[PDB]
Amino acid sequence: SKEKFERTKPHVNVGTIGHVDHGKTTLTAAITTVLAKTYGGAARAFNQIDNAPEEKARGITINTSHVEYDTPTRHYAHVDCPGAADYVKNMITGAAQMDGAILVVAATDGPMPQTREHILLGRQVGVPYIIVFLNKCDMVDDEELLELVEMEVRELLSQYDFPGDDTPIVRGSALKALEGDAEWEAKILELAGFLDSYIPEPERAIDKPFLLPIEDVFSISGRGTVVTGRVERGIIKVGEEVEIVGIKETQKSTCTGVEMFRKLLDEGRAGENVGVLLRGIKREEIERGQVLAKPGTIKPHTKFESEVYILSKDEGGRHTPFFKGYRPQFYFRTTDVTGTIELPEGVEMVMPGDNIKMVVTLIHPIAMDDGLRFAIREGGRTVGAGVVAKVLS
Amino acid sequence: MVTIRLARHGAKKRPFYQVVVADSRNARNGRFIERVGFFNPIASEKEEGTRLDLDRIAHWVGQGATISDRVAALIKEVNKAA
Amino acid sequence: ARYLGPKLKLSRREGTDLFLKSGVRAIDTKCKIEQAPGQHGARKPRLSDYGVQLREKQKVRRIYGVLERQFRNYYKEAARLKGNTGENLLALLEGRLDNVVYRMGFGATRAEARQLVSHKAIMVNGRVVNIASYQVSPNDVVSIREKAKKQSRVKAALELAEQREKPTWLEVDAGKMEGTFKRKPERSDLSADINEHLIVELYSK
Amino acid sequence: NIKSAKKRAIQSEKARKHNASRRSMMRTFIKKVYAAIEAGDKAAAQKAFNEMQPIVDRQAAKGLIHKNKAARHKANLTAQINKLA
Amino acid sequence: VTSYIGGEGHNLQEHSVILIRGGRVKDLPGVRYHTVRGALDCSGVKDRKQARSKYGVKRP
RNA sequence: GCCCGGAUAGCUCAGUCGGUAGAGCAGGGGAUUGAAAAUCCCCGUGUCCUUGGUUCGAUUCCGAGUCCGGGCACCA
RNA sequence: AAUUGAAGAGUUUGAUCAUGGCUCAGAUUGAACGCUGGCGGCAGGCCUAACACAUGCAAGUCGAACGGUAACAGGAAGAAGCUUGCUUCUUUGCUGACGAGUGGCGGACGGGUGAGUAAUGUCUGGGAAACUGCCUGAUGGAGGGGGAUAACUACUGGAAACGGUAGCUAAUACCGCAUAACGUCGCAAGACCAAAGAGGGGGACCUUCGGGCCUCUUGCCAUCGGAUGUGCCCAGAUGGGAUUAGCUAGUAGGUGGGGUAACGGCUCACCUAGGCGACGAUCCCUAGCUGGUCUGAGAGGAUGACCAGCCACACUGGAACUGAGACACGGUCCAGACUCCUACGGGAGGCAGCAGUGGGGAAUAUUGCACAAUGGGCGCAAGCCUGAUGCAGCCAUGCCGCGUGUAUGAAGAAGGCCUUCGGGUUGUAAAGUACUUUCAGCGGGGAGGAAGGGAGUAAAGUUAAUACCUUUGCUCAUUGACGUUACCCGCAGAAGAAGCACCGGCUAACUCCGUGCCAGCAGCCGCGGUAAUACGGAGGGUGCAAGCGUUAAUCGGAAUUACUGGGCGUAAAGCGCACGCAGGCGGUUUGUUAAGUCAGAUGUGAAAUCCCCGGGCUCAACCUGGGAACUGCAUCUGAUACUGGCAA
Numbered sequence A: 001s002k003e004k005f006e007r008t009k010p011h012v013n014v015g016t017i018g019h020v021d022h023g024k025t026t027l028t029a030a031i032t033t034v035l036a037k038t039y040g041g042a043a044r045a046f047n048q049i050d051n052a053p054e055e056k057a058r059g060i061t062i063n064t065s066h067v068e069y070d071t072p073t074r075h076y077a078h079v080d081c082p083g084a085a086d087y088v089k090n091m092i093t094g095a096a097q098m099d100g101a102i103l104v105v106a107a108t109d110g111p112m113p114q115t116r117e118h119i120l121l122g123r124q125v126g127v128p129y130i131i132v133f134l135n136k137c138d139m140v141d142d143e144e145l146l147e148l149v150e151m152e153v154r155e156l157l158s159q160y161d162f163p164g165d166d167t168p169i170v171r172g173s174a175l176k177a178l179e180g181d182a183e184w185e186a187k188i189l190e191l192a193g194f195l196d197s198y199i200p201e202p203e204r205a206i207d208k209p210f211l212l213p214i215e216d217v218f219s220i221s222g223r224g225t226v227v228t229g230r231v232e233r234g235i236i237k238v239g240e241e242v243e244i245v246g247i248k249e250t251q252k253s254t255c256t257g258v259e260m261f262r263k264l265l266d267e268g269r270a271g272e273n274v275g276v277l278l279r280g281i282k283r284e285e286i287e288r289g290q291v292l293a294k295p296g297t298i299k300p301h302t303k304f305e306s307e308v309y310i311l312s313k314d315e316g317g318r319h320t321p322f323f324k325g326y327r328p329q330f331y332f333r334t335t336d337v338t339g340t341i342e343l344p345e346g347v348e349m350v351m352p353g354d355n356i357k358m359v360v361t362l363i364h365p366i367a368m369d370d371g372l373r374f375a376i377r378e379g380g381r382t383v384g385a386g387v388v389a390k391v392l393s
Numbered sequence B: 001m002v003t004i005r006l007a008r009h010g011a012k013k014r015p016f017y018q019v020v021v022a023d024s025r026n027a028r029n030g031r032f033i034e035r036v037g038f039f040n041p042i043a044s045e046k047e048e049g050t051r052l053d054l055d056r057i058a059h060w061v062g063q064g065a066t067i068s069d070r071v072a073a074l075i076k077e078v079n080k081a082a
Numbered sequence C: 001a002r003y004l005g006p007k008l009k010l011s012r013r014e015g016t017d018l019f020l021k022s023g024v025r026a027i028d029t030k031c032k033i034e035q036a037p038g039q040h041g042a043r044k045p046r047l048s049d050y051g052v053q054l055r056e057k058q059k060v061r062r063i064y065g066v067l068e069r070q071f072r073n074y075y076k077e078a079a080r081l082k083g084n085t086g087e088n089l090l091a092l093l094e095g096r097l098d099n100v101v102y103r104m105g106f107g108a109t110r111a112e113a114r115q116l117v118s119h120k121a122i123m124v125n126g127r128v129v130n131i132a133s134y135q136v137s138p139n140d141v142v143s144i145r146e147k148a149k150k151q152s153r154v155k156a157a158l159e160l161a162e163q164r165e166k167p168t169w170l171e172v173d174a175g176k177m178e179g180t181f182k183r184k185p186e187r188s189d190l191s192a193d194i195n196e197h198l199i200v201e202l203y204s205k
Numbered sequence D: 001n002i003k004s005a006k007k008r009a010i011q012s013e014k015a016r017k018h019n020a021s022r023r024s025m026m027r028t029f030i031k032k033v034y035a036a037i038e039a040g041d042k043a044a045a046q047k048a049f050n051e052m053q054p055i056v057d058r059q060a061a062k063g064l065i066h067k068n069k070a071a072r073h074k075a076n077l078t079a080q081i082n083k084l085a
Numbered sequence E: 001v002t003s004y005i006g007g008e009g010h011n012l013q014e015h016s017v018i019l020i021r022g023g024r025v026k027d028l029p030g031v032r033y034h035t036v037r038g039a040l041d042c043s044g045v046k047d048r049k050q051a052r053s054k055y056g057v058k059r060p
Numbered sequence F: 001g002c003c004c005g006g007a008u009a010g011c012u013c014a015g016u017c018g019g020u021a022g023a024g025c026a027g028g029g030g031a032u033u034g035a036a037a038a039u040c041c042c043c044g045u046g047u048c049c050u051u052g053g054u055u056c057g058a059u060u061c062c063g064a065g066u067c068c069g070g071g072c073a074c075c076a
Numbered sequence G: 001a002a003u004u005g006a007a008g009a010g011u012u013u014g015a016u017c018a019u020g021g022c023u024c025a026g027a028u029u030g031a032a033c034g035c036u037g038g039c040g041g042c043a044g045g046c047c048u049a050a051c052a053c054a055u056g057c058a059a060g061u062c063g064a065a066c067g068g069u070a071a072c073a074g075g076a077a078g079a080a081g082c083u084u085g086c087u088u089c090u091u092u093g094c095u096g097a098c099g100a101g102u103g104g105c106g107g108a109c110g111g112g113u114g115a116g117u118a119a120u121g122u123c124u125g126g127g128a129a130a131c132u133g134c135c136u137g138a139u140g141g142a143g144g145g146g147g148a149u150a151a152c153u154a155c156u157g158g159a160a161a162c163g164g165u166a167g168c169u170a171a172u173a174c175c176g177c178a179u180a181a182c183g184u185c186g187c188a189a190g191a192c193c194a195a196a197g198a199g200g201g202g203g204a205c206c207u208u209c210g211g212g213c214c215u216c217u218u219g220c221c222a223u224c225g226g227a228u229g230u231g232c233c234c235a236g237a238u239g240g241g242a243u244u245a246g247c248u249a250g251u252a253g254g255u256g257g258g259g260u261a262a263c264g265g266c267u268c269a270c271c272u273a274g275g276c277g278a279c280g281a282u283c284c285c286u287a288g289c290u291g292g293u294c295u296g297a298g299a300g301g302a303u304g305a306c307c308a309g310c311c312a313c314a315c316u317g318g319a320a321c322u323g324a325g326a327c328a329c330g331g332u333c334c335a336g337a338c339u340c341c342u343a344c345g346g347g348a349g350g351c352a353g354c355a356g357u358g359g360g361g362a363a364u365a366u367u368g369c370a371c372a373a374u375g376g377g378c379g380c381a382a383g384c385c386u387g388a389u390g391c392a393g394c395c396a397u398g399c400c401g402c403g404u405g406u407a408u409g410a411a412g413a414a415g416g417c418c419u420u421c422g423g424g425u426u427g428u429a430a431a432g433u434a435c436u437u438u439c440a441g442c443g444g445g446g447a448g449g450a451a452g453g454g455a456g457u458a459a460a461g462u463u464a465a466u467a468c469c470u471u472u473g474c475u476c477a478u479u480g481a482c483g484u485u486a487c488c489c490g491c492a493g494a495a496g497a498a499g500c501a502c503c504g505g506c507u508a509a510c511u512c513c514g515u516g517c518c519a520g521c522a523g524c525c526g527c528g529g530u531a532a533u534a535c536g537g538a539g540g541g542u543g544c545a546a547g548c549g550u551u552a553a554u555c556g557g558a559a560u561u562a563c564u565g566g567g568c569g570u571a572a573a574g575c576g577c578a579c580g581c582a583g584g585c586g587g588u589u590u591g592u593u594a595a596g597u598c599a600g601a602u603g604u605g606a607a608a609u610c611c612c613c614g615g616g617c618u619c620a621a622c623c624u625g626g627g628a629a630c631u632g633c634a635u636c637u638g639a640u641a642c643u644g645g646c647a648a
């Protein structure tokens, strides 16, 4: 916290996606070192990304570790999700902010079970565009075998609603480009070109009132409690009133300071990932899941009508009916919450692969409006997405 | 150093300066030997406004004591024969 | 600050006319006066020593429009002052501006006189005053400014002052809506009904 | 420290070297008189006394020694000389 | 200490962090405190229209 | 953010390694009493913490939560 | 013009009167909590961990201390490019200014916090053996040289903090020499002791053209002063415990030497074996003290947040140094603990200054703006410094003011609630017609806080002088953080603006349903067992109302620790009974006596706070002028009945 971040170049929220032990932290670490040397960004290393006793004794990503690197045209803000079966909740918070993704497949193994589950989760939340990166290559010195894997990735995307053949499948090692090989360094500089060319400049909302869903809370020793998250809409100013709304109850506060990757900001606008400092609030009372709205706009609710689209075996969901009393997990913006379903009159059962309305009573109150969407999950697998119809409370 | 100076008493936005003889080291509203009238800059053309005992100033200044920037003006204000 | 509720209900609880709902009309006889405080008005009170003291205080409050925190501070002032404590209480209550404006005739009811004072209509010694509790010292000249003077909630109300007793201690011009508060109010002049003795008891303990 | 008025530290150190040199000098000329005292005439003590008498007053006027200290140091030491010798 | 839990129906079970005020009951021998309702984890009693400063309940 | 443990009728507890839930104490109904106790005659009075799956069938097999318990970390 | 003040009730019983606890009504708080919230004014806002701290920020300042024009910006003698005044550029204290660092003076104040401390402290009243910087009264002097020594080079050590060697240089830093006296010492004669120049301007004379010389300003050392300080000493007062009874060896006192600014076991050396203690030493626990605050009719009881005086402390323990003054909050040196840094050699730092953090907790705020005023530091001044302060935000946390319409309004409408179904009641409440526009919303006028400083101009002082300098009028240009200020005017229009306790008795206020010793209430007595005024809900009522209750806390009521003001035959309470030391108390007459006693006198009883009368915020809180008050305390002079001494 020292340098004022000057607002040059359009901000793009990027993140990696992939299977476990399949290239991801190494991919980001290579992007950090390569873009530092040629284009003249900040250095950093692979050690600073993933850290602590829990992510070393095993050697896996559990929390969402972020990076900020720059190119001539645009400015990027990377996110490394955990990619594993047990940590799928905190993966969704990183994936929700992401506009243009970097999928990671491997030329040795190929497609894996969670590579399918990641892409299935992304569309229901909000991932318009996606790029593939074959992160091994050099392990198999053969032209025929490597190109057979390229064919399999186009099938995954085209089956599950995407361009498929139009998506640029770049190839190359991360470990060779990390240390400094001239042929492999330039092949990741080519991926930087595809991030600019393929993914467009995302359209932000700088008009409708201020909102900020919290992905993860912090406690800076000196200043107080800080809350990170993408500014989903509107603008923030250092001094304005900020009514916290969500789980538990509803608190009043003021914005002490906005920052972007340990650098100051006056006007933190919509689209970019910023960490807002609060006035006289503790680490205990503020929870991961709540939202920072402008006073008077949004109101907390725990009962709502919604036209939910349940999925069948073809898309990816259930294969059996269910009566009232069913309690799955609802993923609104960032965090999950349980809720009992109440079906309408003249509706005995809910078959899979059907379009119906339903009143859902949540256990906690969460803020919502008419137009918002979510993705239901239960039993380590998806159920179906929907859209909010009417507020009831 | 003993000095004849204003103490500043009164309410917020409505001050009332107790002109007073105290040591320089001592605080604004600290100890003093004794007072010597008062000053008020928010009286207007009415009965009362400012006071200054001219006999006590001749005692302290005759012995040895400084007169502050504002109290120097109040000795000019009362005049000798004007 | 004020009661702002059913006014004529408060006259039935005490029984006597508190001058609340007086106005342009002379006498009410349009509320079942005396024998209907609430639902159970057919009931008759036994009334203890605390009761008789409390009902007297409660009556003198609602006549002048004063609340207990403000009223208790009026009592403490009377205890300090010399002479009879009872006659000093009523002297201070009469010394309010909203009460003096009511006695002048510039206001048909006391709530009208209170709001007429509040809305920058009442002037006194050339100074505009908005406070009902303004303690009016003797030898004053209360008056209405030319904006509020000769409007249609004053000339109608001033005709009621002809029917009224008209106190000795003050004078009214009734030409250019001008007033003259002459001296302080004496006990023997006003009241002649409401008890001062019982209120002095209640607060002494 | 976090101040540019640390000049007083290096000034006081530069002072106390200068101060303690003259301080010690004074109290050896005093001890030189006490060497004559015990077994000596009004001559060995007096010559030593007339050497320290000018130096102790010059110290007293400087402000290192406080002139009352000098007033003792002559008086209380002359009482040794005048009585015994 | 032992604290009397007022109202009809309560949230407490084994643990749960609760605010305690003073006030003997004059009924149970030894219980010399009252558990405050509304404060922290002991929530308000359901459907109490009259007297709701005691028992920590809001307006309808 | 993640690792673990805990939850069986109103309270205190057996139960199981797939066959449709028990024990004691309590409580309810009837006769007596103004009402109880005892005395006499009859009753489990259950969302096996909640909810889905593997099964013809699950407290007991496997997921996902609930609040609570304790443990380990990150620091715009 | 300065005191006009004292209430009771419930509760032992079948009932009574006692005794006696328990409970309640009232004030108040740095309060919290729960339910609710519109504004303005003035106050307040870590009581617990004196637990731990990231970040910024709280003390600097002068060229009027002298070299150096070390940097930077102007001018001026001269130079080089060429659009010969447009540009390149070396010297120059002649001005503006201004250094890593040497001096002068400040940092010891101002701020913060109560860990310790039960007497070293604090309070009140006296006292002799002291010093006191700048401020300032007075009397003299203010002589002339010396060496260094940082800057500044050089060569070097280091990651850094931070050096080292060898040279050169100035002074109001430092040291001797003359010169001294009412200063110092001695019985005297004597001996001895000090300093610094800077700053503006200028006629004659004098110029080696360095200036001498005059002159004003400031500035400088010696002494008797003054004031404010500060140090020390004694007397009384200043919490609880005897289930703490004997403590004390530099302990108590002397003589001598040392030491202290000063007296003194302050400290060594003998000498002497005393000093303290039932009018409580020692030991133990708890505690900053006071003005005051709260309460009380008062005597007292509680307390010592905020405002102010004193002490004590500054990460823990210790020590001294520099200074007039510290054994030093934001100095030094050691050790310790505990965080940071590192090139692993070694070095940093101290929030019980302001903000903020975590933590503890029932619980307490912004990492704001300003030197415009008020003092504070240095300054000739210009200014610069300031989390002292003055504002602003936050928080119903207090105290107080105004709001939330106002008249008329019968079909006594509708709907709710009760019922003897006749009707009553919610209720002139509501709906309508007549009428406002505090405060909020918007746009304009707009004070008072600002006294001074800057330039110029005439006169008076000052001098050789119409010059500078010092003073006084007198013109111009100005100086505001608060600030869309206080206040005023208009604009539109019922527009934006009410809860929450209680309702058996004490204690103001009733019925109906639901439940049936269950669920629950409660401050005491107590309510609930199928007709509940006490439980839960409903309508009605009562009291408070931007507050209301609940909890805790202190006094009060409690004459329930009783001095004023209680008791002890049987209610709690006469030792089982004597003798008796200290202690308390003492028949009666005449003296004296000044201790009690009283009477007067003097100084003191800090200011605020309190009480009385005034003045000012539109009013009140709030502020403020005067007086009384500060019930006392010490001495001085009397009275001499009563108390006491020594008497007869």
Ligand SMILES: Nc1nc2c(ncn2[C@@H]2O[C@H](COP(=O)(O)OP(=O)(O)OP(=O)(O)O)[C@@H](O)[C@H]2O)c(=O)[nH]1
Binding pocket: A017, A018, A019, A020, A021, A022, A023, A024, A025, A026, A027, A059, A060, A061, A080, A081, A082, A083, A084, A135, A136, A137, A139, A172, A173, A174, A175
């Ligand atoms: N040889 C080679 N090895 C690779 C390459 N990319 C990744 N790896 C290996 O995979 C390891 C990195 O695994 P990650 O993908 O970071 O594991 P992760 O973070 O759990 O992955 P996610 O679950 O996607 O978050 C490294 O230890 C590499 O040895 C590559 O291009 N070449």
Ligand SMILES: [Mg+2]
Binding pocket: A024, A025, A026, A050, A060, A061, A080, A081, A082
């Ligand atoms: Mg990873």
Ligand SMILES: [Mg+2]
Binding pocket: A021, A058, A059
């Ligand atoms: Mg692995």
Ligand SMILES: [Mg+2]
Binding pocket: B028, B029
């Ligand atoms: Mg002050």
Ligand SMILES: [Mg+2]
Binding pocket: B003, B066, B068
């Ligand atoms: Mg001064």
Ligand SMILES: [Mg+2]
Binding pocket: C069
């Ligand atoms: Mg009020």
Ligand SMILES: [Mg+2]
Binding pocket: D004, D005, D006, D007
């Ligand atoms: Mg310095």
Ligand SMILES: [Mg+2]
Binding pocket: D016, D020, G321
């Ligand atoms: Mg030394």
Ligand SMILES: [Mg+2]
Binding pocket: D024, D028
């Ligand atoms: Mg020696």
Ligand SMILES: [Mg+2]
Binding pocket: none
């Ligand atoms: Mg030596």
Ligand SMILES: [Mg+2]
Binding pocket: D027, D028, D031
């Ligand atoms: Mg020696």
Ligand SMILES: [Mg+2]
Binding pocket: none
């Ligand atoms: Mg010196």
Ligand SMILES: [Mg+2]
Binding pocket: none
């Ligand atoms: Mg029966």
Ligand SMILES: [Mg+2]
Binding pocket: F034
């Ligand atoms: Mg019956």
Ligand SMILES: [Mg+2]
Binding pocket: none
């Ligand atoms: Mg039983």
Ligand SMILES: [Mg+2]
Binding pocket: none
């Ligand atoms: Mg039974």
